[PDB]
Amino acid sequence: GVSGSKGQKLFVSVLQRLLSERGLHVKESSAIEFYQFLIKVSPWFPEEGGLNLQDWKRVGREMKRYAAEHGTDSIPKQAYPIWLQLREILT
Amino acid sequence: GVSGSKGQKLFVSVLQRLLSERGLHVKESSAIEFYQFLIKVSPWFPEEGGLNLQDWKRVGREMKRYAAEHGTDSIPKQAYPIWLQLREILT
Ligand SMILES: *C(=O)CCCCCCCCCCCCC
Numbered sequence: 001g002v003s004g005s006k007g008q009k010l011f012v013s014v015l016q017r018l019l020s021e022r023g024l025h026v027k028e029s030s031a032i033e034f035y036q037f038l039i040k041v042s043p044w045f046p047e048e049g050g051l052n053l054q055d056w057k058r059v060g061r062e063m064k065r066y067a068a069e070h071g072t073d074s075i076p077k078q079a080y081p082i083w084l085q086l087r088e089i090l091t
Numbered sequence: 092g093v094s095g096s097k098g099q100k101l102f103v104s105v106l107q108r109l110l111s112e113r114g115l116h117v118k119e120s121s122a123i124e125f126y127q128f129l130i131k132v133s134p135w136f137p138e139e140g141g142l143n144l145q146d147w148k149r150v151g152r153e154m155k156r157y158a159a160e161h162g163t164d165s166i167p168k169q170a171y172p173i174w175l176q177l178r179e180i181l182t
């Protein structure tokens with residue numbers, strides 16, 4: 001269950017592994033910010049979610065919902081690009 | 092939330108991705124049994140650990156100590172095979 005920085009090291013390490021295999025590298029600081037954004041919008045994801053296209057699509061919808069409510073500038077510039085690359089991996 | 096299976100779906104999904112790309116397939120129930128064993132012996136791992144050799148070697152030591160103390164029949168048969176394969180994936 002998420003709470004602050006809990007799970008952050010492991011998430012970042014898995015994310016970096018997945019993206020790097022497609023030739024895309026993310027700074028650790030950017031990957032941390034992405035994690036913090038994800039658990040803010042979709043806290044159910046570590047707890048109840050799977051790394052599968054269905055649940056990842058739900059995360060995407062929830063990220064877009066957040067932008068609709070708080071504005072585009074409110075979300076990390078790397079969030080949609082990282083989300084999209086993981087979506088492609090899951091296809 | 093007081094679900095007893097927090098994180099289990101995410102774990103099973105990531106484990107099955109990593110193992111399948113090496114040609115190895117684990118029954119869902121077996122992957123769940125492994126997760127429950129992992130968080131029993133090494134509750135710090137999802138919280139603070141990463142998918143790296145130092146952390147995974149530590150989980151390895153802790154699993155072995157559990158076996159020394161409780162006997163090898165108290166441990167899932169698939170636990171050491173799974174741990175070993177993940178050690179190699181990190182190498
Ligand atoms: C709170 O939500 C608990 C979160 C537990 C997440 C399960 C851990 C996810 C691990 C996936 C990677 C496993 C690699 C060995």
Ligand SMILES: *C(=O)CCCCCCCCCCCCC
Nearest residue numbers: 001002047092093094095096097
């Ligand atoms: C998971 O199901 C979250 C449940 C959290 C329950 C909190 C209940 C707290 C009751 C005691 C409150 C005392 C302080 C006012």
